[PDB]
Symmetry: D2
Subunit: 220 residues, 4 copies
Amino acid sequence: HHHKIPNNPGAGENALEPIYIKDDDGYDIDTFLIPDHYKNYITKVLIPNGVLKNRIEKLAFDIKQVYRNEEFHVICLLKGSRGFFSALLKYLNRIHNYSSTESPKHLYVEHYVRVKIEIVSEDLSCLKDKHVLIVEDIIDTGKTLLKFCEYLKKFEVKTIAITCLFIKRTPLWNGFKADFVGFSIPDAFVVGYSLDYNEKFRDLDHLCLVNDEGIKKFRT
Amino acid sequence: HHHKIPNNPGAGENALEPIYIKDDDGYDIDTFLIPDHYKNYITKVLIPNGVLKNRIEKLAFDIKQVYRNEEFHVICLLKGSRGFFSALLKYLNRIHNYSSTESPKHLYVEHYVRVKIEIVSEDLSCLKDKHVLIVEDIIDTGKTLLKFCEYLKKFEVKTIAITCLFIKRTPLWNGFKADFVGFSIPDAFVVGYSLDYNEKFRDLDHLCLVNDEGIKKFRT
Amino acid sequence: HKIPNNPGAGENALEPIYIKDDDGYDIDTFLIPDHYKNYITKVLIPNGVLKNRIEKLAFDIKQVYRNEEFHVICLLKGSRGFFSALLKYLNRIHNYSSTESPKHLYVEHYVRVKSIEIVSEDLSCLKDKHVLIVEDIIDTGKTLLKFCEYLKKFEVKTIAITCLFIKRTPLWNGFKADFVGFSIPDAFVVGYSLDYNEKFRDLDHLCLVNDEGIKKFRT
Amino acid sequence: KIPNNPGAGENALEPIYIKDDDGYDIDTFLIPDHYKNYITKVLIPNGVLKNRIEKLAFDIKQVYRNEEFHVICLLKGSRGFFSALLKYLNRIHNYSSTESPKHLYVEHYVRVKSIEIVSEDLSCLKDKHVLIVEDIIDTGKTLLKFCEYLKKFEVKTIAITCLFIKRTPLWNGFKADFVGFSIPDAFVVGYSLDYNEKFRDLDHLCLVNDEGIKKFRT
Ligand SMILES: Nc1nc2c(ncn2[C@@H]2CN(C(=O)CCP(=O)(O)O)C[C@H]2OC[C@@H](O)P(=O)(O)O)c(=O)[nH]1
Ligand SMILES: Nc1nc2c(ncn2[C@@H]2CN(C(=O)CCP(=O)(O)O)C[C@H]2OC[C@@H](O)P(=O)(O)O)c(=O)[nH]1
Ligand SMILES: Nc1nc2c(ncn2[C@@H]2CN(C(=O)CCP(=O)(O)O)C[C@H]2OC[C@@H](O)P(=O)(O)O)c(=O)[nH]1
Ligand SMILES: Nc1nc2c(ncn2[C@@H]2CN(C(=O)CCP(=O)(O)O)C[C@H]2OC[C@@H](O)P(=O)(O)O)c(=O)[nH]1
Ligand SMILES: [Mg+2]
Ligand SMILES: [Mg+2]
Ligand SMILES: [Mg+2]
Ligand SMILES: [Mg+2]
Ligand SMILES: [Mg+2]
Ligand SMILES: [Mg+2]
Ligand SMILES: [Mg+2]
Ligand SMILES: [Mg+2]
């Protein structure tokens, strides 16, 4: 197929189905290598580090398939998207190096913002007439991404697409769909892979569920 | 714990329980990156490449726990165990580089054999009074390892332990258990990760099931 | 050791790799993207050397911060490659260490500094904290001198600077890092998140731009 | 096209020239603690090895494109070079849309002693393109006779890829078709290269000091 470049933020019109992580599946602690200082604070491993990398590699492939022959500006939503973002660039670089047929005019430009609606970033005025690809780690209620796309309309961009690693199946979801989705995960608080609980558990390579002890230990 | 070093080949006395791959689960083709030349010959992806490495990383951890501060000789069963073997060495080296308390007399020595009982190797007499760890890719009926352990007992080795990446749940299984098991997989013919079908699909990074077209296509 | 607390001095700084003047590799030696090959003179430092050096820097950094929480600051957007690579090996050390405490590790922070302008969030939370600044390259050292002085306004405990490349420019103001990777000749380099007009960031190797490259991506 | 003159290296691209007396000291990279007192210097970092091999795999695929070729791993010193080679070879095949499962690579494993060969029948290599993967070329005697031994099984072509070639005055003039590094006349270990079965697990290519030779002498 010839894929149209996505330009309807929240719709996910031609979005491919993500990996469906069923309710109450995964692996126990002793299955993979988990840091000793985190071992007593984790219920179970939801998604192994290797699966994440393998999925993102396919996401990077899907993204290149639709942005083939156009330059696009990626926006990293600090600081939870850092792991997802860097892995994405890694596999994007690999694609540009192993398929040939390439032009230094159809590549990507890195941008970094922090969203809390208030924005800590650069001017973003240079995004006019540009293809924007938003890189978010996780969608819960969809409030953050909904507000952010309206704020971005103020800079007169050409298109807005959203890639997301995890979508939580929360009933509080407002219907905001990403155009490139990695995983569909249960309604549980997850940590690891740059996803945190009070700035802890970011360095955990696997996606895990926090137990009662972890929440209590690192509570503010 | 204080672990005894295993010396009862086929018993799996203190074997830790492996990952249970259930019947009729896995991922479709469009989930991960599959080579275009193999895509029409694969039913589904059983185990992603990343899960394999993450489990093997833990196996190397489990292996080091019982062989800590002891020299042991690893035996690679060519040519299907190659991938498992290389990954095992990578993470073993990883452990040695990230530990201030080790000695060059407590490491591992590589040996390579070909089993078709016919054995293609070098001496095997140098294994006298040595700790031996057999590295097998997959145990099906358990006949190969049962005879091989008897033949290996002719060289007066100290101990014989077996690590295995996949054990198939075949009713024809003779009860041979490995001491370090990675995955327990359904009774289906799998390929990928150095596992072949008529010397094909070895270069496939994921563990997959061949469809009917694939079996017919590469039949001799 | 002692934990460094004198930004610009490099009191106990270890000697870095000295990349000599007029050495490196030609284009056909390593893998270079086809779209950048005609715009590159030579490969100065291979991608693999970078990873191996950073892996050692992470070891030196953990040696002095062992049992201490420290805050790493990524100086966007050129330090990104260095920063992510640094965390990878730091996690690696923490993941195999049976003598660690989740209260004593590292905390990530991100700032954008241009020449002096600061785009960030709080940094007031760096009070009574050990600060480790992660910079990709030191040229004249002016940006880092003002930033370390400005950072002194937040009453932090310590300020240490780790740097991947230091250029031997006669314009150097004498600012020394505490953890240096390479000492490079006075030439304009690109690759490994180092750019020329937002280009060449995706280049895995550290390379020198030719005259055509300068003209092509000129503004 | 396909190299078919073993030992000549007719169209071999010149490799990286590691000059006499360059490299890095111990405190430069990560070295295992049980090996630090037994190593003089680091000659070639592990990363340079991988990056060079990645380019070698590219060069190899350029000439074998659209044809089946059989790779031969000379155990057990070529294991490191071989596994990395297959990694990047697979890497190319996984991102290429013009590949054919009829035209890829087939792995073989032989063990060479000093000339006797412990392997399979090798009769399945009849009329096949063969690529020999050797860890190091010193005098070139071992590889010279093996090519003669392999040419009796009626193979189509014989090409040789080598990671390191030593500048020893005892060299017989045997040239490889795909060369990684040209290294000085010194005994190196690491990256599956051994000294009495030691230092194989060493990720960097290093030079053994006098104490190390003394320590692990048989
Ligand atoms: N570790 C975890 N984090 C979560 C979880 N659900 C949400 N979140 C996110 C919490 N969180 C932050 O910590 C923001 C600051 P940073 O950590 O730097 O990205 C925002 C939440 O992301 C979802 C929002 O975008 P949304 O609700 O508007 O869709 C979760 O189950 N675990
Ligand atoms: N790809 C796959 N291979 C399999 C499968 N079941 C068995 N096997 C193995 C087939 N096979 C070989 O091809 C031997 C040659 P090599 O491939 O070079 O190691 C031996 C089988 O391994 C199990 C025997 O040791 P056992 O029956 O005695 O326990 C399978 O479901 N998929
Ligand atoms: N590609 C290259 N970039 C360089 C080079 N020397 C400096 N620089 C840096 C150029 N540069 C920027 O592009 C700033 C924006 P960003 O790329 O997003 O961090 C600042 C320079 O960094 C040195 C300052 O810290 P300093 O002057 O205080 O020592 C160089 O030889 N090549
Ligand atoms: N670690 C090191 N190993 C070396 C060195 N020079 C040679 N060699 C090789 C030593 N060696 C072996 O140990 C054979 C067994 P294996 O190690 O399992 O392949 C053979 C030598 O390879 C060169 C032969 O092909 P050639 O001399 O006939 O040209 C060296 O400077 N360091
Ligand atoms: Mg977020
Ligand atoms: Mg959070
Ligand atoms: Mg087998
Ligand atoms: Mg087989
Ligand atoms: Mg900078
Ligand atoms: Mg710049
Ligand atoms: Mg050899
Ligand atoms: Mg040897």
